[PDB]
Each structure stands twice: as C-alpha cells, then as structure tokens.
C-alpha cells in the first residue's frame, strides 16, 4: 500500500538537509524526526500540529518562503531559529496532504491566504487527524530514518 511514499519523500523534502545549513536547526531537524513521531502517536496528531504551527512565523514569510517550494527549487531556509526551519516541516506535512488527496490544493492554497480560512483549515485537519496520522506514519518514519542515516 505504502511503497511510493519513499518516492514521495524525495520530491516533497526537496531540501531539509543541505540548504538547512549551519548545523543548528539543521541537525536539530532530527529532534523533529524522532520526538514528533513519538509525539504524534502517543499524544495525538492535533497536539503536535498545534505545537508545530505555534512555532510557525505565518506572516507571509512563513507563508510564501514555503509555497515557493511548490514551484521552483531548493529554498535555503536560514531565516531565524526553528520557525523557517519549522515552516518547512509544516510544508512537509501539508505536501503529503496535497500529494495524497487528503486535502486538495485549491483549499489549502486558499486556506493559507485569508487568515479567515486558516481556522477551518485546522478545524478540518482536526477531523482528518485519525486518517492522517495512520497514513503519514510510514512517510514520516521515512524521513526519521533519513535523519538517522544522513541528517
């Protein structure tokens, strides 16, 4: 069932290893990798998601310094402490969510463009949290093992 997720990680990730440079918030990503996973199933998906969006800088910088990844190239994501190194992770999860038709782009792109629809974007993620948590599990453990090996 899950055998293209390992293929999806390459062109979803696209860079959370190299252009995450300076080795602080670069190596720190592995803490995301392990902890969040144990966080995502011991504590739930929505608690971890609220935590991740908390660390998001959702102005337009951490709203477009990521939606630029949909289109162009590797995005050196220096910015500041893990808020741009954290909005790439929000991007990771939402990239899985769009490339697997759990939530479509036309909503996502529209949900992150008014701040009126961020709320019901999250309110809809809340209803999809069981299914989402079940489905991303292997797709996440993929990048967790990527981190163990490479990052």
């Amino acid at each position: 069932l899950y055998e293209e997720d390992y293929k999806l990680a390459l062109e979803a990730f696209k860079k959370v290893f190299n252009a995450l440079t300076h080795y602080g918030a670069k190596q720190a990503f592995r803490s995301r990798a392990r902890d969040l996973v144990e966080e995502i199933y011991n504590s739930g998906f929505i608690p971890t998601f609220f935590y991740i969006i908390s660390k998001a800088e959702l102005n337009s910088d951490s709203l477009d310094s990521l939606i630029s990844l949909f289109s162009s190239d590797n995005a050196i994501l220096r910015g500041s402490d893990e808020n741009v190194s954290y909005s790439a992770y929000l991007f990771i999860i939402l990239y899985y969510l769009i490339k697997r038709g759990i939530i479509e782009q036309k909503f996502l792109i529209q949900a992150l463009r008014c701040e009126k629809t961020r709320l019901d974007l999250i309110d809809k993620l809340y209803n999809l949290a069981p299914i989402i948590s079940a489905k991303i599990r292997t797709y996440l453990l993929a990048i967790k093992r990527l981190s163990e090996a490479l990052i």
Binding site: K106, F107, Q110, R113, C114, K116, T117
Partner: protein, 173 residues
C-alpha cells in the same frame, strides 16, 4: 462542447431570468444525493452586487461567492459580456465535490464590470431568516433540477445545507 453556467445563491433573488436549460438533459453538476447539496463550485476573488445581481472582478482572494452549477446557457440574450469560458474541469475549486467532471466546461459567470466609480466595501454575509429562504425552494431548485420535490420533502436537508454553505462576499453597496 460540454457547457455549463454559474448561478450564485444569495438571499438576493435575481437569478431567475438567466435560466434556459432548466433540465434540458439528464445531468447537472450540482444535485441532491440525500447527504447534502454536493458539487457546489465556488469562484474566489469575486464580489456580487445586489443592484443588478452579478459578479464583479475583485483582486482580494477571499472575496468569494458560492454558486450552483447546472447544465444551462443563459437563454442567449445574455453571455454577450458574461464571462464565457471553457475549462479543464480539474482546475475548478468545487466545494463538496462528489462526482468530478469531464475536463471541459463552457461555463458562464454572471459578470459585472469593475465599476471603478465606488470603492469596494465587502462584508461576508451568511443566510438566515427563512422568509427569504422559502422562495428558494421554488425559485432555484424547482426552477432547475430534475428530482426537485420528488426527493426533498424532508426539506430540512436543503434548508440547513443552503444555510451553512452558501455565503458570499457582496459589496453591500
């Protein structure tokens, strides 16, 4: 030549002259499947006017209008200046998608010119006050669909769905 037409659903009842193909065939995009009014496409970045009810091209993304899509052509007195456009029916942002469509749709936005006279002041409006909604059952559905009043005498379905879904960003002016 697959063809369609856009018909917005406010409390404002100015959508009963641009209807030609009520049923006209066997299909629409919007229908009733006893679990909601499905396939309600929504176009984003457009405001409605109550004066000569139509759509006006706004740049704001979340100035969005909800509307019904049914297999129709506006009785070809209109469409002269209406947004007449053929689509790939994959790049359409439809709410409550149940059945996806055939990659080509001659659709018609009821269009209004930008009207650079007034500066737009849009406000989100959600429908209530059933006095304005009773006229919808005959004014839009019975006007168009096939199964109207044959599948919905439990009209609460198309009451609370029409309520909780069909909002819009009008100019209120």
């Amino acid at each position: 030549s697959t063809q369609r037409e856009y018909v917005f659903i406010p409390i404002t009842n100015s959508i009963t002259i641009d209807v030609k193909i009520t049923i006209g065939g066997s299909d629409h995009i919007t229908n009733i499947d006893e679990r909601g009014i499905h396939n309600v496409l929504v176009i984003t970045g457009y405001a409605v006017d109550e004066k000569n009810g139509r759509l006006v091209p706004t740049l704001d993304p979340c100035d969005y209008v909800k509307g019904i899509l049914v297999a129709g052509t506006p009785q070809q007195a209109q469409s002269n200046d209406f947004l007449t456009l053929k689509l790939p029916a994959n790049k359409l942002y439809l709410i409550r998608k149940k059945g996806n469509i055939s990659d080509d749709l001659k659709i018609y936005i009821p269009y209004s010119s930008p009207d650079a006279r007034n500066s737009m002041k849009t406000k989100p409006v959600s429908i209530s006050d059933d006095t304005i909604v009773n006229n919808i059952i005959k004014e839009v559905f019975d006007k168009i669909y096939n199964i109207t009043q044959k599948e919905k005498v439990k009209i609460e379905k198309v009451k609370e769905d029409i309520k909780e879904l069909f909002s819009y960003y009008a100019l209120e002016q």
